UniProtKB/Swiss-Prot annotation, chains A, B, C, D, E, F, G, H, I, J, K:
The lineage of its organism: Eukaryota, Metazoa, Chordata, Craniata, Vertebrata. Residues 1-100 form the PB1 domain. This is Sequestosome-1. The modification Phosphoserine is found at residue 22. Changing residue 78 to A: No effect on interaction with PRKCI. Residues 41-100 are annotated as: Interaction with PRKCZ and dimerization.
Length: 100, 100, 100, 100, 100, 100, 100, 100, 100, 100, 100
């Protein structure tokens, strides 16, 4: 299991709302194309953040993760998630949520 | 139940009058053609706003709702109402009333 | 018993006069059509505010009550009164009186 | 699905009315010549904008879309629509409606 | 039994009112759909906090609980309650009440 | 018998006035609905504090009692009184009186 | 492997969006003219920045890299890339993305 | 029930050992002369203090209780115990144990 | 399960060594006289503290627990343990170990 | 793998030397009694700290780990190690080394 | 090639002398036991620092490297060097030299 921490950013980049959800270490929830048609972790995470942060649009936001440099990188692909977890050594995945 | 908030706009787009009414989560009040002859939610809402905002014409106004972008979209169809509620996560439906 | 507080608003929305009256928890003062011909609480309240606030017209004013959002909603129906009291938990009903 | 945003322009090129409609990602609604006799997306869009913007003529208007440069290009062909969508990366197609 | 401590937060995030209630270790008060139609602990807690904190709206507030990091996470689901109790080792469940 | 000590709090939460009254260990003074219509200890205590602390409103105050944590919990129910006495081992019930 | 960091510049030369991608130390992805018809690294990088920075045009931007002096040099040739990497000693290639 | 706290005093009247035992509010444990032959509370208390404070003699000590003045009064009679409890209002009986 | 925290006291009553062990909520480990011949929790705890605190004698020490007053009470009976746990609300039992 | 961080403490409890070693998540290095004769993790860790901290005795030191309270608990048993790791969520095990 | 930067520390942990040397990416300079009899990188580095920092003893010093936490870890084994380089992403290995 891997708890993912999300940080909501308003206009002054100030923490509006905080919420976390339990995630599986598994690559993807489903295997069939009826349930995985390419993505998996990204589409899963972006789903929870939507229901968790109703303050903004359901799918009208980008999640930005810090890199080795610290800069924000708006991720939106499973390939980018596998990389983002490579940074964190612990079982906590922090990310910066922003509404488009 | 779903409370619908209406905002009256004069000439300077300034809030003239504020009023709310309790609405049902149901699709339509009646089923017979004697009582539903196509519309339902739109005709119902537009009815209340008229009696609630006597300051203007009874049926000589358009209700504009914000979209995902924020822009105003003068709705006047049930199909447009079902969509407008899809935006709001809460049980409060805000709309911008304007007299023609 | 339920004390109703009224706030008179001039031109600058400034408290002109303040006055309160004792009201009954009962639905309506009378039952016969000779004394209740539809309304009850609204017609009763609007009656007192008139005699209490002679500064303006007797029946040429609208009483606006705050909602869950805080916005003003010019009430003028018994059905709207029962709802307005649902907001206040205490035995004090505050309202914003304005002359038309 | 693809929401198309339209902007009405008066005399001072000022936003008169705003309205949006849900569109299909599909090439055309119908395949038979009885229902597609050459056009498809253009004729479909121009149909909605007419019913949506009754303020002007039903078919006496031209829809202008921004290009790579930003300039307005009055489109009126399906071949031009497929190209216009190539600009927008998102699922929102903005266009400038003008009455002839 | 499990005593739940709630902390009311005004505008300056200062403790407005403090109140506690005795809760059952049981999963849910009732089993029938007439009495449990999905939720249980969340709907129960949120019910008490409403009657306990009349200072704000009855159901117009979000309860935020500290996580392993300490950040506030506005919970509103039974699945989130079972997790929140997993943090506290004692028989005291602290939470931060905020009115919407 | 059980002596109840009350502490009056001004603006600086400073002890304005101190007064005590002898109470009965009994559940309620009366049994008939003409004399007990639900409450008993709360309504009894709140009655004395009013006559004892005329400095403020008769029934426009809340009595807050310390819990196991020490925090103040504005009680106003008999069910809450039976619990408050469970804390004190002695025959002295201390409480913090505050005018609304 | 070599991570390339890109910096998006608006109108005030302020960092709009940040995103990184993993690159190969290899000269070119493919060798055949069907896949390398002259360029290689430039065309590859400019491809990613496009998909990564959809905020602007797909191929309507120039990437500027700092020199020994620090000044910006809009590169757009493989010969210029091999040189740009000669500056950085680490495995991180920073560049300034600007939309034309 | 009544918890009795005992304080052991060495040579410098310093608290050597602390220990408490649960006592009954009842006058005497037994009624028959085979079990009550005059004393009751004194003989009972002095019994526990012996087993509790083995540091000194089993029955070679005197228990001194504070009076209204505060001075120590070596009690050793049931008649003296009933009086000693009359001082304490709470359910805690403190006494000063000293070995002869 | 119940973790018991022990505090070693030298000559200056300063924490020499700290160590904890997991205990069972059960009354006693065994039931037969071959394994319970009267005691149970006391003999069990005093056993662990010995092996845990080899700094002093194996069975030449007394464990003192705080009471309602805070004073130290050298316990050495199962009847005293059941009482000591009645103080702590949590699942942590703190005690002051001293070598005789 | 699990990196264990050790902190050397002189006379003023000041960090004398810092050193870390890579450990296996496995229960024990060996299974045979020739290589595991009861202990495993404790004997393994205490072995490394000795070779790593030659400043003091090889086996004349105690490693103290923080608990839930924060206090130091001189561990020296495998059963105590499994518990110490239960505190840390990450893959880093910190401990306070002290020479006897 | 890999340049190793060393920092000399006096009494006030102030940078006394700075010096760097070019190192090989290779595991060890020699393979024969006449030239590698176990160590390699450590013995090589410690050799240069000696000739480079004649201010102190030739082999009477310890080199401390920062970890993931930042704390100093006096390394003196090849196994520790391979790990220290794993931290630095660049081709620069910084270390804190201290004379024993």
């Amino acid at each position: 299991s891997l708890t993912v921490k999300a940080y909501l950013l308003g206009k002054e980049d100030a923490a509006r709302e905080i919420r976390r959800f339990s995630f599986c270490c598994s690559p993807e929830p489903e295997a069939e194309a009826e349930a995985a048609a390419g993505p998996g972790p990204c589409e899963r995470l972006l789903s929870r953040v939507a229901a968790l942060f109703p303050a903004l649009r359901p799918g009208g936001f980008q999640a930005h993760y810090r890199d080795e440099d610290g800069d924000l990188v708006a991720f939106s692909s499973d390939e980018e998630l596998t990389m983002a977890m490579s940074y964190v050594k612990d079982d906590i995945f922090r990310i910066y949520i922003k509404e488009k």
